[PDB]
Design a protein around this nucleic acid. Structure first.
Lengths: 806, 96
DNA sequence: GATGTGTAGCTACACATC
DNA sequence: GATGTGTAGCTACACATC
């Protein structure tokens, strides 16, 4: 009697609660009524028994199935009971009606019930069992030891579940046990869990103290975009100013670097808004104080950050001026001055350029006062601080108008005296030269002045003693290279360079100190870019530098050869008194083959792609060797090389039809060779093993169709649709298809052929030929069934596109 | 020339997806209306709590850990701007 | 000012099927 | 693994709200 009445009372609440959230608060108020009435009659366990039974009805349901209203009903019922308990304890000195016992007994009994399906075979049951626990975990109150150890054990097993969905519910349940062991489990999944959404769940709900923060912020380079975005959108936002006090400056500096340059705009905007809005408002708009947080020695990112701040806040922009009150200058204001001024020029802010900045002559005054204060001394972190201010002011000076003749002439005396200091740091040499170049507006004027500065330094060492000290030659070769870098006229028009080349450039190439020789090559290379004859006479010597030289020399000497070809074309080889092109082709082989020098492989590959794009290199066999190194197993561990090819081969194939063709002709043979490499690699057994160091022939094949797809060309004539570049390639693959022996490979090719692009405009004859070879394969050497269907799909399309004969 | 620009606009802008090479290249172009809580289930619906049997329900111990930690590799930011310009004279560029 | 809430539409992922 | 379809998580601009 009573027992049946309880079931109906509780069953009716569920029967109408599944349909709508409307009357849930009444349902909860009723359930507590049925319960309280059931316990006084002595039928407490009857209420718990029927409450359990009825919840078992929803477990088989799929996720996102609207009859999770019961789930939301169970959670609301547990929460309210606990609320009454906590409240009742405060109201009353002593709980007189066993209120705590009933709750303690109901919750323990209920958890153990649902835990009966925590390892159920059904995907859906496992999910909702963890879902139920997740939504009621916080309000369980106090549990005895046995129940506690049963939850952590059951959860620690399900963190490794098959379905990611249940694993997300597995972390949610674990976030409630943090504060010991629960954190270690979350730290293991935030790094090792394959599902990007489990990483995300653990990321957002982890404790975020001084211990876990390194693991949370590590997600800023997660392969998933949302995860990389949320570290900026939520974690660093919720921390507010905690980032500046609690995060170590170097981890902090890297985070903003990754964000401002991330490959996804979504992530970039997330980081930008964090700077231009959240952090700036957090510091009450004090623009200078923000720059103190963003360390400015890492300027490149501070530029991306400030350049982003100006776009998000044009009003703050107009305000800042630089009156003659320069007495307040610091690294932050020095940086601002540069960023603001060059930002104005790039966007033609007429009004601001006019009065917001001092006049040229007035800037040279300040610029000098800092040089005197640093280099004419007679503390250390003051030296680095002054050198930085000189740099910033000098970058703005390079682009100053200099309409005033006095200003132009005043600044010129400051840089000329700066470049004459033997103690000037390389950063200030680089920019110092750039300003002198801007001031002359006459290349010969700029050259004659720089040579004097160089020779004066050289002579003062020789005369003060007959070839100058090695330390001095460095000072001249670095100043010399930064000069030649901006010289764009033949040597014959500047007679001093040939004399500069006679007295320390060519001697430097003959030196014994590696660092001087490398500098001597860089200047020699820079001279070759001006006089063709000079390049020709040194091609042999550079080639031998790249053959026998150490790692560093090999590195610089090879860039010179690529730059000589980039400028002078093929005129420096294959002629009278010149080197043979094959002699240099082989040099690139050894370098692109030099597994032991990865950094050298990069420029050999990046460079070889530059010369094919420029149409100075055209040998197919070399090009073929170029692509095979990309897919080769030995090079797969050279990230710089992999990313280089990943960008360069596409641009070569898509740059011009004549280049895409060269891939089509060679692509088929490349696939064949790479099929032999992979196959031979799966069979061979060698302690180092690793058969995964190579892309499977199905992805290689796939990749080759993408590069040969005429729809990816940058230029679209409209007559590029009748392009057979992709057809001829597939034909070449159906011909070499015969030469493959293994079945799984022959399956990897034939199952992807349908990605090809078919159009009626394509040549009839070449479509016919492609069909002939498709039929020949289909009707003779019989395939798997999945392969057969793929090949029959192609023929069907061919048979249809061909059929448009009218 | 336009060749640089024509190449510059097309490529840098959202051909990054394949910036890692390797397989990482995409280039990709009612029911259960209601329940009746009153109707009986006579002891064989509650068999929801069956044992796994030979169903798996667990990850292969292979995938539980990955040395890569599912992070990006270092970004060397190969850009069209980087290929058009010389090595030792970045200001100047080859015939382009 | 700052938080809600309506709409819509986008893109890299995850999901499903065999 | 090669298909095709579904969705979490924003992204933008519009207003009402306290």
């Amino acid at each position: 009697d009573i027992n049946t009445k309880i079931f109906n009372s509780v069953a009716e609440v569920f029967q109408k609660a599944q349909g709508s959230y409307a009357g849930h608060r009444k349902h909860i108020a009723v359930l507590k009524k049925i319960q309280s009435k059931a316990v006084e009659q002595g039928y407490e366990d009857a209420f718990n028994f029927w409450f359990d039974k009825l919840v078992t009805k929803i477990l088989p349901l799929k996720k996102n199935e609207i009859i999770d209203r019961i789930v939301k009903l169970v959670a609301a019922f547990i929460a309210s009971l606990e609320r009454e308990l906590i409240l009742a304890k405060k109201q009353n000195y002593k709980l007189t009606n066993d209120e705590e016992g009933i709750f303690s007994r109901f919750v323990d009994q209920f958890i153990r019930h649902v835990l009966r399906g925590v390892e159920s075979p059904d995907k859906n049951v496992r999910f909702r069992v963890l879902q139920l626990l997740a939504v009621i975990m916080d309000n369980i109150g106090e549990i005895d030891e046995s129940l506690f150890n049963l939850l952590i054990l059951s959860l620690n097993k399900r963190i490794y579940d098959r379905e990611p969905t249940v694993r997300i519910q597995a972390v949610f349940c674990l976030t409630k046990f943090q504060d010991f062991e629960a954190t270690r489990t979350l730290v293991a999944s935030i790094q090792n869990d394959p599902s990007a959404e489990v990483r995300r769940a653990a990321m957002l709900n982890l404790i975020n103290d001084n211990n876990t923060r390194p693991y949370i912020l590590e997600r800023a380079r997660d392969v998933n975009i949302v995860n990389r975005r949320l570290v900026y959108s939520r974690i660093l936002k919720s921390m507010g100013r905690k980032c500046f006090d609690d995060i170590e400056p170097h981890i902090f500096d890297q985070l903003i670097e990754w964000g401002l340059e991330d490959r996804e705009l979504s992530v970039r905007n997330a980081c930008k808004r964090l700077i231009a809005h959240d952090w700036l408002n957090a510091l009450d708009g004090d623009l200078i104080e923000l720059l103190e947080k963003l360390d400015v020695s890492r300027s490149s990112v501070c530029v991306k950050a400030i350049e982003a701040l100006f776009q998000s806040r044009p009003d703050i922009l107009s305000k800042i001026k630089f009156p003659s009150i320069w007495k307040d200058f610091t690294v932050e204001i020095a940086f601002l001055f540069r960023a603001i001024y060059l930002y104005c020029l790039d966007n033609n802010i007429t009004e601001m350029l006019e009065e917001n900045f001092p006049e040229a002559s007035k800037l040279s005054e300040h610029l000098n006062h800092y040089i005197l204060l640093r280099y004419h001394h007679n503390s250390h972190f003051d030296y680095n601080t002054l050198e930085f201010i000189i740099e910033q002011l000098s970058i703005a000076a390079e682009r100053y108008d200099y309409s005033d003749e006095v200003g132009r002439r005043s600044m010129l005396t400051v840089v000329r005296n700066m470049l004459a200091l033997t103690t000037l740091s390389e950063p200030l040499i680089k920019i110092g030269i750039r300003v002198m170049k801007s001031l002359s507006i006459n290349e010969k004027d700029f050259v004659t002045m720089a040579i004097e500065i160089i020779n004066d330094i050289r002579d003062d060492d020789i005369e003060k003693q007959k070839e100058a000290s090695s330390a001095t030659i460095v000072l001249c070769l670095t100043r010399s290279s930064y000069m030649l870098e901006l010289v764009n006229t033949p040597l014959t028009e500047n007679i001093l360079i040939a004399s500069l080349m006679d007295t320390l450039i060519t001697p430097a190439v003959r030196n014994t100190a590696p660092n001087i020789r490398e500098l001597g090559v860089k200047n020699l290379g820079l001279c070759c870019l001006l006089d063709v004859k000079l390049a020709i006479d040194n091609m042999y010597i550079l080639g031998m530098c790249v053959s026998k030289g150490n790692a560093s020399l090999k590195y610089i000497a090879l860039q010179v050869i690529v730059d000589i070809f980039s400028v002078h074309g093929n005129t420096v080889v294959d002629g009278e008194g010149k080197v043979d092109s094959i002699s240099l082709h082989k040099i690139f082989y050894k370098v692109l083959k030099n597994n032991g020098l990865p950094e050298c492989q990069v420029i050999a590959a990046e460079g070889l792609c530059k010369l094919f794009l420029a149409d100075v290199f055209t040998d197919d066999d070399l090009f073929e060797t170029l692509v095979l190194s990309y897919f080769s197993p030995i090079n797969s561990s050279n990230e710089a090389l992999v990313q280089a090819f990943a960008f360069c081969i596409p641009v070569y194939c898509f740059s011009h039809p004549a280049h895409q063709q060269r891939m089509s002709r060679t692509a088929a043979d490349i696939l064949l060779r790479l099929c032999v490499l992979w196959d031979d690699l799966q069979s061979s057994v060698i302690p180092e093993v690793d058969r995964e160091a190579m892309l499977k022939p199905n992805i290689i094949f796939q990749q080759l169709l993408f590069w040969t797809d005429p729809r990816n060309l940058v230029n679209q004539t409209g007559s590029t649709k009748k392009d057979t570049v992709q057809l001829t390639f597939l034909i070449d693959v159906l011909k070499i298809y015969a030469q493959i022996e293994k079945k799984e490979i022959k399956k990897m090719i034939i199952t992807n052929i349908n990605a090809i692009f078919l159009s009626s405009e394509q040549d009839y004859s070449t479509l016919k030929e492609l069909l002939e070879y498709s039929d020949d394969i289909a009707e003779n050497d019989n395939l798997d069934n999945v392969s057969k269907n793929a090949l029959d799909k192609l023929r069907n399309n061919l048979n249809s596109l061909i059929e448009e004969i009218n | 020339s336009i060749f640089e620009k024509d190449l510059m606009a097309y490529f840098d802008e959202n051909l990054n997806r394949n910036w890692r090479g390797r397989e990482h290249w995409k280039v990709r172009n009612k029911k259960v209306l209601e329940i009746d809580f009153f109707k009986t289930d006579d002891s064989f619906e509650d068999k929801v709590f069956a044992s796994k049997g030979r169903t798996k329900i667990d990850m292969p111990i292979k995938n539980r850990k990955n040395d890569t930690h599912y992070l990006l590799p270092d970004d060397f930011h190969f850009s069209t701007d980087r290929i058009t310009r010389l090595f030792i004279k970045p200001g100047q560029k080859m015939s382009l």
